[PDB]
Design a protein around this ligand. Structure first.
Ligand SMILES: C[C@@H]1O[C@@H](O[C@@H]2[C@@H](O[C@H]3O[C@H](CO)[C@H](O)[C@H](O)[C@H]3O)[C@@H](O)[C@@H](CO)O[C@@H]2O)[C@@H](O)[C@H](O)[C@@H]1O
Ligand SMILES: C[C@@H]1O[C@@H](O[C@@H]2[C@@H](O[C@H]3O[C@H](CO)[C@H](O)[C@H](O)[C@H]3O)[C@@H](O)[C@@H](CO)O[C@@H]2O)[C@@H](O)[C@H](O)[C@@H]1O
Ligand SMILES: C[C@@H]1O[C@@H](O[C@@H]2[C@@H](O[C@H]3O[C@H](CO)[C@H](O)[C@H](O)[C@H]3O)[C@@H](O)[C@@H](CO)O[C@@H]2O)[C@@H](O)[C@H](O)[C@@H]1O
Ligand SMILES: C[C@@H]1O[C@@H](O[C@@H]2[C@@H](O[C@H]3O[C@H](CO)[C@H](O)[C@H](O)[C@H]3O)[C@@H](O)[C@@H](CO)O[C@@H]2O)[C@@H](O)[C@H](O)[C@@H]1O
Ligand SMILES: C[C@@H]1O[C@@H](O[C@@H]2[C@@H](O[C@H]3O[C@H](CO)[C@H](O)[C@H](O)[C@H]3O)[C@@H](O)[C@@H](CO)O[C@H]2O)[C@@H](O)[C@H](O)[C@@H]1O
Ligand SMILES: C[C@@H]1O[C@@H](O[C@@H]2[C@@H](O[C@H]3O[C@H](CO)[C@H](O)[C@H](O)[C@H]3O)[C@@H](O)[C@@H](CO)O[C@H]2O)[C@@H](O)[C@H](O)[C@@H]1O
Ligand SMILES: *[C@@H](C(=O)O)[C@H](O)C(=O)N[C@@H](CC(C)C)C(=O)NCCCCNC(N)=[NH2+]
Ligand SMILES: *[C@@H](C(=O)O)[C@H](O)C(=O)N[C@@H](CC(C)C)C(=O)NCCCCNC(N)=[NH2+]
Ligand SMILES: [Ca+2]
Ligand SMILES: [Ca+2]
Ligand SMILES: [Ca+2]
Ligand SMILES: [Ca+2]
Ligand SMILES: [Ca+2]
Ligand SMILES: [Ca+2]
Ligand code: NA
Ligand code: NA
Lengths: 292, 292
């Protein structure tokens, strides 16, 4: 079954993502196909899938930027029915906003079925142009039609997935303890992680003994990413990934505070030095504590 | 022996503190007696005592605001010699800036002797008016003269002292682990702690599930206090006290993130709720983790 999380949803036949037009929170804003740039935040194209309790394989889909919900207009089962953003809530009983999402007959892409209409999210005519209509349409679970197939490319990790990534790192001290703060995390491309660092004022901050030293840079980076998350997204129910670590060197005679992020594949961590913006597979310290 | 730390230094005969006039970093700025307000940050009246290695009871005294050093002008042993702020470093060999500080014959106040001249810091004539001259003067270690006696009222804690304060709290979980970031900490009056919170923007921040929830408020408060410390003080070698805690309720079914500070007596901690500015002796959670 599809996991709770944040997805970039890409048509299987042409490289168009599901896009809430202009990111607008107005009710009735069209959801359209649109091109995308890999390894970026695609600002209007991220969707938080919230599973519904006791309704197998069925979800709301909140646009991360607008906080509004994928909605089949008036629930109609007519082919060509509008799919728009619309105000709602994560666990609504409104069928217009409830979507049964299960694997297609290719085993990798998914179909997206409205729970009330039983019709499917369809890139009309397989049109690849920017702004192409997405509609509800008649269909079947098993058929090959690529207009109705969608790759759910996962952009978040659970806390357990983050924990796993840490656990297979080679630079973890024997005394390590991790402290988990949230449940579901948007993983940032390094280009975005870097941007937040640049915009934080940290690049200009001078190292000063105790009063503005490693711990202060690492905590300030984590607070900057937290502030960015809230200021940037209107949906709730997830956090932004940015860890702090405390580590000790191999000799046991120096310790350091720094940050960490995750690889593009979500399988491994990467250290970040908030005093200079560098990313390192080996920062020269084994982590004895992390919070994230 | 006097401990490394930050002191407000108050004459024993009249309630005048040792004040670097206007907080000025100019070389030759006079150090004067001046009235003070208890339970405030007295901005021009805080002094960081750095012990010198292998020189018993002898220190530099850096003004916390200016980062300049108490200096006996040209080292003269003449009575009436100026005592001024002057550029220097924490472990200088310049005797003009080195001060042997030991208890007076009352056992509670201290005398402050220049290491090169062997003369003593003296509030001339015991003058209580704002701006009264402080000079080097002839004297003895044992005599009663209040012009040369000074109470060193300690405004910082060591990390070990902070640890002790935590350890005697009644609201510490059996699994608690603390992570110590710095060595010496300025303890803020709650009036100042509050000010930093108000100025941080946190009072206006809305609680939002995961994206701006308890952990984000607590971390943002700690980062605000860190930023305030660096922006406010020019001396190095100390930090500002502001902890983060993670805690669990008595039933074991709810957890929360918050901050903590220390009492005026430095003996106990006080919890702070960064979502509303409240101070509480009991926040309803036992801490299982802290960093500070
Ligand atoms: C059958 C109809 O269902 C609800 O109205 C839906 C709309 O529902 C959503 O928006 C309205 C405001 O327009 C409201 O906030 C509601 O809680 C939310 O779920 C929406 O799905 C539109 C477009 O497809 O269709 C309906 O107008 C409900 O509010 C109505 O009273 C009525 O029961
Ligand atoms: C090229 C074309 O592709 C398929 O038709 C799709 C449509 O497919 C869906 O709707 C049709 C009815 O119009 C039918 O219910 C089918 O099972 C269902 O998948 C639909 O995707 C539209 C809009 O994008 O485009 C095409 O018309 C195929 O069934 C046609 O025979 C034909 O090969
Ligand atoms: C004997 C004299 O000692 C030093 O000069 C001191 C001053 O020392 C402090 O300030 C100077 C700059 O004015 C410099 O930065 C130095 O490192 C610092 O310790 C100061 O104590 C004044 C006032 O009492 O007296 C002397 O001018 C040294 O720089 C001189 O070359 C010379 O050795
Ligand atoms: C009222 C006055 O108090 C004392 O004299 C202080 C001075 O005391 C210090 O300097 C004198 C020499 O002038 C002497 O060396 C003494 O041992 C030493 O403490 C000094 O504090 C000045 C400036 O503030 O004020 C007074 O003159 C006392 O010795 C006097 O006899 C007299 O009672
Ligand atoms: C916020 C905004 O994002 C970008 O424009 C979006 C646009 O973004 C997608 O399409 C562009 C090309 O038009 C690129 O492929 C991006 O990588 C995609 O993410 C769409 O989402 C449309 C329709 O909703 O809205 C635009 O605002 C970017 O071009 C803007 O400069 C800006 O950063
Ligand atoms: C930064 C500045 O601090 C205060 O003025 C200082 C002054 O502060 C002391 O004396 C005042 C009365 O003049 C109060 O008792 C304070 O509680 C003391 O800390 C002195 O340090 C003088 C001489 O260096 O400089 C002034 O700037 C305050 O009155 C100002 O408004 C301001 O906040
Ligand atoms: C880091 C820097 O600015 O380079 C700065 O030296 C610092 O604070 N170092 C601390 C450790 C960090 C907070 C992790 C430090 O060296 N502390 C002394 C020992 C305590 C940490 N080590 C262990 N294992 N407890
Ligand atoms: C706190 C709030 O905004 O009220 C928010 O619920 C939160 O993040 N709670 C977390 C705990 C904090 C990070 C301390 C939470 O409840 N986590 C679930 C359990 C993990 C924490 N408990 C223990 N002991 N590990
Ligand atoms: Ca057909
Ligand atoms: Ca949380
Ligand atoms: Ca620090
Ligand atoms: Ca005398
Ligand atoms: Ca430190
Ligand atoms: Ca959070
Ligand atoms: Na730097
Ligand atoms: Na509030």
């Amino acid at each position: 079954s599809l996991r709770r999380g944040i997805y970039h949803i890409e048509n299987a036949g042409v490289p168009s993502a599901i896009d809430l037009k202009d990111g607008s929170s107005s009710d009735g804003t069209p959801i359209v196909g649109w091109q995308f740039t890999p390894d970026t935040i695609n600002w209007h194209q991220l969707w938080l899938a919230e599973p519904i309790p006791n309704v197998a394989d069925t979800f709301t889909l909140a646009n991360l930027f607008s906080g509004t919900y994928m909605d089949l207009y008036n629930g109609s089962s007519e082919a060509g029915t509008a799919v728009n953003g619309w105000q709602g809530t994560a666990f609504t009983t409104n069928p217009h906003q409830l979507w049964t999402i299960k694997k297609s007959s290719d085993g990798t892409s998914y179909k997206i079925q409205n729970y009330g209409s039983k019709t499917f999210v369809d890139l009309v005519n397989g049109d690849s142009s920017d702004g192409a209509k997405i509609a509800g349409w008649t269909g079947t679970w098993d058929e090959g039609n690529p207009h109705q197939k969608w790759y759910f490319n996962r952009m978040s990790v659970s806390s357990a997935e983050a924990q796993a990534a840490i656990a297979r790192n080679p630079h973890i001290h024997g005394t390590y303890r991790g402290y988990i703060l949230d449940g579901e995390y948007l993983v940032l491309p390094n280009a975005t992680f870097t941007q937040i660092w640049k915009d934080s004022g940290l690049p200009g901050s001078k190292w000063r003994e105790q009063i503005y030293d490693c711990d202060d840079f690492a905590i300030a980076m984590k607070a900057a990413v937290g502030k960015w998350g809230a200021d940037s997204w209107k949906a709730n129910g997830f956090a932004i990934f940015c860890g702090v670590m405390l580590g000790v060197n191999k000799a046991g005679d120096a310790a350091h505070a720094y940050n960490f992020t995750l690889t593009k594949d979500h399988a491994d961590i990467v250290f970040f030095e908030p005093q200079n913006g560098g990313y390192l597979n080996d920062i020269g310290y084994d982590s004895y504590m992390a919070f994230y």
